[PDB]
Amino acid sequence: SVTALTSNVSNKRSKPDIKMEPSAGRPMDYQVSITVIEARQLVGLNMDPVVCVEVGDDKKYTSMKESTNCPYYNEYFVFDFHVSPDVMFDKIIKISVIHSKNLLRSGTLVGSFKMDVGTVYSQPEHQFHHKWAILSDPDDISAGLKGYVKCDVAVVGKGDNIKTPHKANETDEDDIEGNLLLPEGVPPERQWARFYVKIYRAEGLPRMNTDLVDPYVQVFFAGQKGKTSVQKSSYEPLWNEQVVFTDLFPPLCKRMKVQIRDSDKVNDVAIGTHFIDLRKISNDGDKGFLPTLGPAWVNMYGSTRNYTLLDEHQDLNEGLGEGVSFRARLMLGLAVEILDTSNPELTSSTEVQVEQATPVSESCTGRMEEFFLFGAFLEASMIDRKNGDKPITFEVTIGNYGNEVDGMDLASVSSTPPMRPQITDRNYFHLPYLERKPCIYIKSWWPDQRRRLYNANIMDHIADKLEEGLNDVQEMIKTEKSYPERRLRGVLEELSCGCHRFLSLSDKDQGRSSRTRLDRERLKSCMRELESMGQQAKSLRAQVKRHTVRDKLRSCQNFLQKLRFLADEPQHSIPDVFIWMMSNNKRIAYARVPSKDLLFSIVEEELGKDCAKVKTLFLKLPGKRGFGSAGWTVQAKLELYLWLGLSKQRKDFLCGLPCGFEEVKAAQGLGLHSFPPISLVYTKKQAFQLRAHMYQARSLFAADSSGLSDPFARVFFINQSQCTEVLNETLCPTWDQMLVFDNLELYGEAHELRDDPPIIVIEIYDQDSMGKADFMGRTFAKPLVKMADEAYCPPRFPPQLEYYQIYRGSATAGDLLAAFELLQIGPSGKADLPPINRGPIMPVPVGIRPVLSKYRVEVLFWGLRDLKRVNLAQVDRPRVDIECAGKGVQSSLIHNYKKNPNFNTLVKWFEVDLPENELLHPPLNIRVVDCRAFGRYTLVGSHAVSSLRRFIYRPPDDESMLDWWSKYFASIDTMKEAKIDELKVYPKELESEFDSFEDWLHTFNLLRGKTGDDEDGSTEEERIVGRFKGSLCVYKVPLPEDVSREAGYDPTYGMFQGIPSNDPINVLVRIYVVRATDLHPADINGKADPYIAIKLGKTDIRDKENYISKQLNPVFGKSFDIEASFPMESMLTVAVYDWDLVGTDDLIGETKIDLENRFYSKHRATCGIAQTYSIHGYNIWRDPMKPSQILTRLCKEGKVDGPHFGPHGRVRVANRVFTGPSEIEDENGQRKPTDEHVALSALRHWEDIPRVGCRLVPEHVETRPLLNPDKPGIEQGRLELWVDMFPMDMPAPGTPLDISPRKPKKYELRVIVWNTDEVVLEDDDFFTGEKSSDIFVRGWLKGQQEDKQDTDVHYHSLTGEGNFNWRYLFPFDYLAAEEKIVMSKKESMFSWDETEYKIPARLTLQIWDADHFSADDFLGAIELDLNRFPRGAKTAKQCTMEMATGEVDVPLVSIFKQKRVKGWWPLLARNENDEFELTGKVEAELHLLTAEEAEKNPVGLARNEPDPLE
Ligand SMILES: [Ca+2]
Ligand SMILES: [Ca+2]
Ligand SMILES: [Ca+2]
Ligand SMILES: [Ca+2]
Ligand SMILES: [Ca+2]
Ligand SMILES: [Ca+2]
Ligand SMILES: [Ca+2]
Ligand SMILES: [Ca+2]
Ligand SMILES: [Ca+2]
């Protein structure tokens, strides 16, 4: 399908998206999860490689491996920040190998890899996995590659918790060069380059010292910085100086900080800051180009220009947030010179220098041209009455011109005349400008580079049209309007037409030589990019279909963010336009509108969207005061006309204002034809009347301490506002009410007031007994306007009610079901108004109200679990009420909560009136109270169902020696990428694939207390002090016959079949916690000591003495025994705590399972159903109740025929046939026939049963993420677990699986070193200087402190020869699953407890030259990896350099496969050229034995008995 709709479908145009707190610019919880897996092929002579990872301002060190050139670390570090995304993305990640770090000194740098957080956020999964960090020495350009570090860099934020790959077996033969740590497209041969940032001059500075400023410019790149000279006493300084950075091209930290700063000894402080995002001024590849801009200007914004000793708006000067005023403008430039590393002439340092750059004339940026900003304040209202009833003016200022107080022919005036406001209501004023709308005019001089803002205008105009299409499409998926794919193809068709229009409009007048290096290449790149996105748009039009409108929206959002990235040209010309409320000549509130949407052009695409048009500037509080509780109320709201352009072009600067005005001008400007006025006067005025159809509200903000509201609301429009009736004690008011503002006064015959009406503010208020009315949020609106000649008829009128989204700030706070119609009072008066169908309160007329239809609400009252106290008091007799559309019922009381928490009457029902329109149902309001005597109904909680769509009922249609961990490790290999049976590793919670097991038992949450903001509050779980278990079933009041057949009408149990007994049934519960991954640390060593503590009912189990210490990916393997009674007790946490020596044991994370939903589900989530039956070994069947009898139980409870066992090999459930292996072995291996394999196969085939058919729960290890009340929103880990549920009325549980962690196989390695040859003669003779070598060999498997044994010394070799025949002995533990040697030791010498570790198996033969008086002198080394060491040469002649280089001429051996290898091996060192070379050869005999083979064949140390050596 190709056909499309270019116009807007939904009525989102009457719903503005105005918000004072966009969450993309506010502080947010961000987490950095780093790992250092290993390192390989690093450059250095006998080093101790520590890998240090800094993020931004703090660093965490890895533990020190010793004497290794291919080490292995495998630990986890976690960094926490609560900053805005721009502060977060500018932090630097420096994976740098250092060595020999000690207790007062930093280590010697080997090499560093730099990558900012902005690039490690921008992957498709926000991370790199198993990637190698290319290191390089910063102190020398000519130094080579210094090694590679395996890592998983990863950065996440609160929001979309995007997954990490689960840590399976890692025994891959990985190549470094195929898995380098690089994004898409960057070549790995990154070359040194010098970053010349040329800073020429600045203009327009404010006062900053007292009457004085002393500026300079400081530039930041990748943690390096460099600042120019101090220009003393100059508001228009001049440096013409370049700062010389040097960093590897292309840069992996792609954002630059320029900043003008006042130099001061007392308070050195930022004046302004611009962020040159390098992603748009550079490119890579065949069409790529070097990072460049300039000679061009840039505009910086920040705090208020007036001088203060301390400022709370200091964050805006440092580039954070959005500035409230102009600060300065700075001339800048950039060019990159790629260094020739083979040239010996240049200096070797990459250090930042300052130099005098080549200056350019002022004509290189275009000649100066004069500009003109004109304003006309048509409306001003909703000034906050807490500001006072002082007269209100508005100061407009662009740059510094027009700032009549602080802005260091026509004389410009920028302040409207002061005049008294008039009261609209108790909270808001209106400025009574009436006919005399004031005006301003400003003359400013800026350099003429309008083409930059013209290109940015076309790009951001395309971006605004695409964003309007994105929001329109998204809101019409939500509101379920017809045919989304036509609207997506229509906005994409308009995208292709916009690409074609940009391809034929931005290419004009290319002959201007002032166009810089960035300008021409950026125009060419945007031509190419919009051509390619026209082609991609035409392809994506075919890509979107009937099934993919919800996931190609991600590609459309990618197009939108790329267009916004293209649109923000960092080369600025015209600084922004600022409006400022004034009282007593002091600042209150601000608006900031960018200059390009005000900039004038003949063609519409280059013309700004706000030029010659009226804009609704909702003025915000400046700085920190504009968010949260400090900025709750609307500070002001304008309807302000603004025009910006050339004074040569200002003939049409009055055309967008409403017609019917006359001009009154200043005393120095009387009589001239083109002098702008200081105030208009309107002879034309229209009478108007707006009807606020305020019918309903849903999902509102609870502003009372009972989780409730008394919501009326005040509807605002220009000068008048009225309140609806205060409905008492509901979160869903139904006012059914028409407010009517009469004799309203518009002024002027506006062009298309139908399409752009004045805005309607609506604010909701919770009335209390004090007389206060709490601020329950704010929504915005536009009325549908009928003229006197216009008819009141479909499809336009009447104003059908829609959902208008209320925000208390950044946080969402509900919807209004409301609508508005604005009507002019014509020549006939009120006669041409629409007809009006309780006293003064008028009802909502027909055609506007929802058409009510008769329904029936049948509700299951299952019970209540674990209600908290009402501030001290126990609840023990609760009764549940229902409020829905004026009707409802109340159930029977719980007469004894301490023994039966269930209601006596299980189903109660009533009839109700609900609207025919399927999105217009009110929220059905469960309201559980505590039914005491004397009318003391203390409210327990209230649940408002968001939509009844969940509840509308419609009728249906050795290889045999295997532990546990073999069939865990095989299954984790399956999901990451027939000898072992496999379970199902669920990577998320088991709820997420099984619809949370709420087939009929839907848990509702009893909310009390006020809802939370993002500030000083709580989101969801604190309001849930207790939970209601039950169900709803709402359908149209004729009961269908098929609904009665398949759902059942019982006089006490209606619309709920398959119900179980409500009476208590005892259940034995046991919890296998398998493992955990990615845990949050809780100690000063960067690690945690997790133990599992379980809460359920009366039980309080914590494992204080049996933790799994110092392991961020712990092996738990523990089963805990708990008894609890169902359905009353399922408050179950499988929780993880770090044990501490002093103080309490900190909670790492926890999660809730809610076992009553698991037990009563038709999925049978009581215990896992295995893939294969056995009675023996590791695959032994779990349930005490055998699978044939489980099939019998689920045919009994499920009401289906079966099981029909014939022979032992087949079964029938319903009309299907299932088969399986009839014979099973026991522990002795003999065969017995049984029914259980076929029943287990039938159990895994239960989904395709024709009626009751349900995929039952397999044997799982489900992976629940951890959550913390201290730091919610992000994961504190990925715990993995599965649980048992077996009732006491049925066969009792047997002995559990041996879920103890895997015992390591015991081995011993005996390595006799025979001889050596061709060792280079390092030690000169003390007297004659003849070269020699005191040869002895050093070898170990794990480390120095455990394994190292030293061969005796062959003194004074002549050519490299030597004879030892000295035998090593290394006893070690080993598992072949992860090729990890297992060993328990303490982490430190003051450690309290021991800890299991894992390190790879490797024999490090190393020649050494021994001295009796000093430290040992290195000769050569080979790291023989014990599954990748090369084939040993038969002679010393055959031993060559191919045994370590890239060629495959010597293949590899596993000693665990071969068990005995003789050969000669080379031992290497790196020269000053950083290449490997021969420094010696050794002869060796590696023999590996098991522990029993070593015990039955004992040998002595070195050359002694038993089995002596010569
Ligand atoms: Ca100063
Ligand atoms: Ca209140
Ligand atoms: Ca109240
Ligand atoms: Ca702790
Ligand atoms: Ca601890
Ligand atoms: Ca503690
Ligand atoms: Ca020596
Ligand atoms: Ca020596
Ligand atoms: Ca020495």
PDB file of all heavy atoms in Angstrom, residues 1140 1142-1146, ligand 6:
ATOM      1  N   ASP A1140      28.565  -7.320  56.202  1.00  0.00           N
ATOM      2  CA  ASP A1140      29.559  -6.373  56.688  1.00  0.00           C
ATOM      3  C   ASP A1140      30.108  -6.849  58.025  1.00  0.00           C
ATOM      4  O   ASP A1140      29.418  -7.524  58.793  1.00  0.00           O
ATOM      5  CB  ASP A1140      28.997  -4.938  56.862  1.00  0.00           C
ATOM      6  CG  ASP A1140      28.370  -4.360  55.590  1.00  0.00           C
ATOM      7  OD1 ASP A1140      28.395  -4.989  54.512  1.00  0.00           O
ATOM      8  OD2 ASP A1140      27.841  -3.234  55.677  1.00  0.00           O
ATOM      9  N   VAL A1142      31.147  -4.659  60.449  1.00  0.00           N
ATOM     10  CA  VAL A1142      30.540  -3.757  61.420  1.00  0.00           C
ATOM     11  C   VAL A1142      29.295  -3.146  60.795  1.00  0.00           C
ATOM     12  O   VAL A1142      29.205  -3.003  59.571  1.00  0.00           O
ATOM     13  CB  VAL A1142      31.525  -2.662  61.884  1.00  0.00           C
ATOM     14  CG1 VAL A1142      32.619  -3.265  62.750  1.00  0.00           C
ATOM     15  CG2 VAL A1142      32.133  -1.943  60.689  1.00  0.00           C
ATOM     16  N   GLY A1143      28.328  -2.798  61.637  1.00  0.00           N
ATOM     17  CA  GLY A1143      27.086  -2.251  61.143  1.00  0.00           C
ATOM     18  C   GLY A1143      26.177  -3.326  60.565  1.00  0.00           C
ATOM     19  O   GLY A1143      26.435  -4.528  60.648  1.00  0.00           O
ATOM     20  N   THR A1144      25.087  -2.858  59.966  1.00  0.00           N
ATOM     21  CA  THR A1144      24.111  -3.752  59.365  1.00  0.00           C
ATOM     22  C   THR A1144      24.614  -4.260  58.017  1.00  0.00           C
ATOM     23  O   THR A1144      25.552  -3.713  57.430  1.00  0.00           O
ATOM     24  CB  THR A1144      22.762  -3.041  59.203  1.00  0.00           C
ATOM     25  OG1 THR A1144      21.739  -3.995  58.887  1.00  0.00           O
ATOM     26  CG2 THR A1144      22.827  -1.984  58.107  1.00  0.00           C
ATOM     27  N   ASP A1145      23.994  -5.337  57.541  1.00  0.00           N
ATOM     28  CA  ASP A1145      24.319  -5.899  56.235  1.00  0.00           C
ATOM     29  C   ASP A1145      23.461  -5.207  55.183  1.00  0.00           C
ATOM     30  O   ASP A1145      22.230  -5.310  55.210  1.00  0.00           O
ATOM     31  CB  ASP A1145      24.101  -7.408  56.234  1.00  0.00           C
ATOM     32  CG  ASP A1145      24.856  -8.109  57.350  1.00  0.00           C
ATOM     33  OD1 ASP A1145      25.942  -7.625  57.735  1.00  0.00           O
ATOM     34  OD2 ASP A1145      24.367  -9.147  57.842  1.00  0.00           O
ATOM     35  N   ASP A1146      24.115  -4.505  54.258  1.00  0.00           N
ATOM     36  CA  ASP A1146      23.423  -3.623  53.328  1.00  0.00           C
ATOM     37  C   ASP A1146      22.640  -4.416  52.290  1.00  0.00           C
ATOM     38  O   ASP A1146      23.104  -5.446  51.800  1.00  0.00           O
ATOM     39  CB  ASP A1146      24.426  -2.706  52.631  1.00  0.00           C
ATOM     40  CG  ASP A1146      25.262  -1.908  53.608  1.00  0.00           C
ATOM     41  OD1 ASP A1146      24.679  -1.283  54.518  1.00  0.00           O
ATOM     42  OD2 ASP A1146      26.501  -1.903  53.462  1.00  0.00           O
TER      43      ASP A1146
HETATM   44 CA    CA B   6      26.222  -1.599  56.360  1.00  0.00          CA
END
